[PDB]
Design a protein around this ligand. Structure first.
Ligand code: HEM
Ligand code: HEM
Ligand SMILES: Cc1cc(N)nc2cc(-c3ccc(OCC4CCC4)c(CN)c3)ccc12
Ligand SMILES: Cc1cc(N)nc2cc(-c3ccc(OCC4CCC4)c(CN)c3)ccc12
Ligand SMILES: C[C@H](O)[C@H](O)[C@H]1CNc2nc(N)[nH]c(=O)c2N1
Ligand SMILES: C[C@H](O)[C@H](O)[C@H]1CNc2nc(N)[nH]c(=O)c2N1
Ligand SMILES: [Zn+2]
Lengths: 410, 411
């Protein structure tokens, strides 16, 4: 039960002992593997104290003060505060550590070599949706940094009794609207049709274009959410052109520079932060492969292949594959030309292998979800394809949570 | 207890009850998923329940469960076990078992074909020369002048584990690999260790880049013996590109018949350690893995050079561009020579239809996403978006150690 992982391209073998510290469950059993399943009332006083203890133990071990006066003192202080208030508050030092380690533990994230360079914005003093809007504009501007992107998270007040949740209703701070057409097709991003309508069916007036930046729908302290438009000068966008095909410009494609996931839940020492938007920078395939070429998304392969004059009669001409490469060359070329941070899938997966070897050496392992880490194109020519990975759940963590409109006591 | 899988591109939801008939373990637990791990002497004691379970499944499939034929067969197998410690399958049971091992192979994307399998019964074989003869006939039948036909040849089952039949080749047709004193490799690097064994056993190696390996065959636990497959039985395809005339000058070719020969077939608790099986190629097996793996022929650089791509920064995606061209060439060459092949778009779409059909008629279809998704252009194939459940059903194909690590040499 001191497990080994092999890289089959290089024969490097790493021994994982970190998994023995895993706490939550994977969804698999000895009889069935659920590795490809996408998604496999508050804490009571009894549940919360062990969770705090485990977190504080690892925090004080990380600062080389395990079993110290200050350590035992903090355990006592939090234990007293839980007994008293039925919750507790993290010191700023513990909050920053917990957020950095939530990212470090995110087994589906290929970008984790950067995990220790996260800018943490403490927004626990926030009380209103206007205040949330202010914190998010500041996040967006800080992270965008005129195209030299910097990783950041903004942490809003923690769940109390679940009636007073802070939530960002958008799935990302910056996404494009989706409108179902009269005839039956979809204009804009189909993934956002429901949210685009909860915006319209709540106040928003839509340009009804192909790339309309959605408004923010912000919920403070459990109240009804409020619409806010992000200042357009804070939303950095990149028009997509190709370094060889002059007609690529005519396709009319753009994308935004800042990937900022806003719908997840951050868990630190048993406390729950239901509103914790975080951002980094894009790996090129997220836009070029998934956003543009998924059939349930912008689905542009047909149109691009036609402009390339490829033989689309048979699938064995690999015209889809050929167009796919060109689309992704253009995405990287456009971001690079406009000096907006982006990473290609070869560079990012190579970095993740180096990160894995760092984590195995200095931590005893690194939880990793191969199904998500392997890029959605050219899988086996990236080094992570040949890398065995162990997947398990460590805390602090980012977790999924239900969409708030299915839950909101309106 | 029922289980749901969702296709996130179509929202089709399927319900799995077949996983309840799974017995063998996956390697995973509630606390760790080993879904990407490559790899995660039997007594009369455990054998009759394994036999009974198989025979119950067999007689159910033929709508004779509980019949007198069913009960007599159980009785007969039971008494054959206690008196001889093993038993023999009827021909009907062998064919059923082999087809169902393929049906149950969760890493196989080609399973829509599972019921069209030609089963060759080689259980009367006794010598390596006899094995060579059976294998040649399999190769000729399966190749069918380029119109490939799925087939499996089944040699005698394990008895005491000291008399195993084994094919020491990992596939019936493979190219040799030679390590040079300067550290480079000539031929297929995956086959260096096996090539060295063949040479040690007396094979005269041509020492070229595409030398078909000899067969190394072990009957009845004896030392293995070398045989050369008749060259006229080995169908090969020279690789050229439909637009790039310089591509032929890379000197590439491949063989048409993929025939895996190192796995173990388990049926009713019986173990067939020599059971070579063959189908036809999915293009990416050759064009992505065999040609472009860094540890294989590794032709990306020279192809990208001749294409004159920007090779100075990986963000030109020169590797991705060359990879598509190589895979176009593989498909074009096989089709032009009229040798059966399937592209990864067709094969993944067939597998989705197969999988849905299996959920309807069978209650499930065990599938290993990590292996089913093709190694290029993953998310533009429909299997990428398909949730899958992986579990172990018998009859099954299993891995077994390479024979040279376990064989006791007679000398
Ligand atoms: C800075 C560069 C980063 C890159 C290139 C990157 C890359 C990625 C990619 C490609 C995915 C798969 C996403 C998808 O397919 O939708 C992912 C998932 C994820 N990323 Fe990262 N990311 C970065 C930064 C961050 C940061 C700063 C955080 C949080 C502080 C984070 C947390 C996550 C999480 C939680 C997931 C899903 C993991 C899970 O459910 O286990 N990432 N990332
Ligand atoms: C007829 C066309 C077939 C195609 C296109 C096909 C395709 C494939 C592919 C692409 C793989 C992944 C292997 C790799 O990447 O190296 C695979 C695995 C496999 N195939 Fe098929 N195959 C076919 C027929 C067969 C037949 C006839 C059998 C046996 C009777 C078979 C049994 C298997 C098994 C046992 C595996 C490994 C599965 C596991 O460990 O669960 N296949 N196949
Ligand atoms: C900071 C960051 C940077 C980046 N470049 N990319 C990122 C991608 C995600 C991400 C997006 C969508 C996801 O999928 C959600 C659906 C699957 C179930 C609901 C997940 C999965 N956790 C993660 C999160 C953060 C990212
Ligand atoms: C009939 C057939 C046709 C085809 N087109 N392709 C086929 C591929 C395999 C196959 C190839 C390589 C494998 O990998 C070996 C590694 C696992 C341990 C070492 C496995 C393993 N399950 C199966 C087996 C049969 C195939
Ligand atoms: C069904 C399957 O789990 C689903 O398509 C997953 C596969 N791998 C993925 N990998 C990444 N990085 N992102 C995804 O959205 C998905 N989707
Ligand atoms: C580490 C990883 O499990 C290993 O590289 C697997 C990944 N998926 C694969 N899928 C197929 N079809 N064939 C393979 O050899 C592999 N190798
Ligand atoms: Zn698993």
């Amino acid at each position: 039960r001191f497990l080994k992982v092999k890289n089959w391209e290089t024969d490097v073998v790493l021994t994982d002992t970190l998994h023995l510290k895993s706490t939550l469950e994977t969804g698999c059993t000895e009889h069935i593997c659920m590795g490809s399943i996408m998604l496999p009332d508050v804490r009571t006083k009894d549940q919360l104290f062990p969770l705090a203890k485990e977190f504080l133990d690892q925090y004080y071990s990380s600062i080389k003060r395990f079993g110290s006066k200050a350590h035992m003192d903090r355990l006592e202080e939090v234990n007293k505060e839980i007994e008293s208030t039925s919750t507790y508050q993290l010191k700023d030092t513990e909050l920053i550590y917990g957020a950095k380690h939530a990212w470090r533990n995110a087994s589906r994230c290929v970008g984790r070599i950067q995990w220790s360079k996260l800018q943490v914005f403490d927004a626990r003093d926030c009380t209103t949706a206007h205040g949330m809007f202010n914190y998010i504009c500041n996040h967006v501007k800080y992270a965008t940094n005129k195209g030299n992107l910097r990783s950041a998270i903004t942490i809003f007040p923690q769940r109390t009794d679940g009636k007073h949740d802070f939530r960002v209703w958008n799935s990302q701070l910056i996404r494009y609207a989706g409108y179902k057409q009269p005839d039956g097709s979809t204009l804009g991003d189909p993934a956002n049709v429901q949210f685009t309508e909860i915006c319209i069916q709540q106040g928003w007036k839509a340009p009804r274009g192909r790339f309309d930046v959605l408004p923010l729908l912000l919920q403070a302290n459990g109240n009804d959410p409020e619409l806010f438009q992000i200042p357009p000068e804070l939303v950095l966008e990149v028009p997509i052109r190709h370094p060889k095909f002059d007609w690529f410009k005519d396709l009319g494609l753009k994308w935004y520079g800042l990937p900022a996931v806003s719908n997840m839940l951050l868990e630190i020492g048993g406390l729950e932060f239901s509103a914790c938007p975080f951002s980094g920078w894009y790996m090129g395939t997220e836009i070029g492969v998934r956003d543009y070429c998924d059939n349930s998304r912008y689905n542009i392969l047909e149109e691009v292949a036609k402009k390339m004059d490829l033989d689309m009669r048979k699938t064995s001409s690999l015209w889809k594959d050929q167009a796919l490469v060109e689309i992704n060359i253009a995405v990287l070329y456009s971001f690079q030309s406009d000096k907006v941070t982006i990473v290609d899938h070869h560079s990012a997966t190579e970095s993740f292998i180096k990160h894995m070897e760092n984590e195995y050496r200095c931590r005893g392992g690194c939880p990793a979800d191969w199904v998500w880490i392997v890029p959605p194109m050219s899988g086996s020519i990236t080094p992570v394809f040949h890398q065995e990975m162990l997947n398990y759940r460590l805390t602090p963590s980012f977790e999924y949570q239900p969409d708030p409109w299915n839950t909101h006591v309106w």
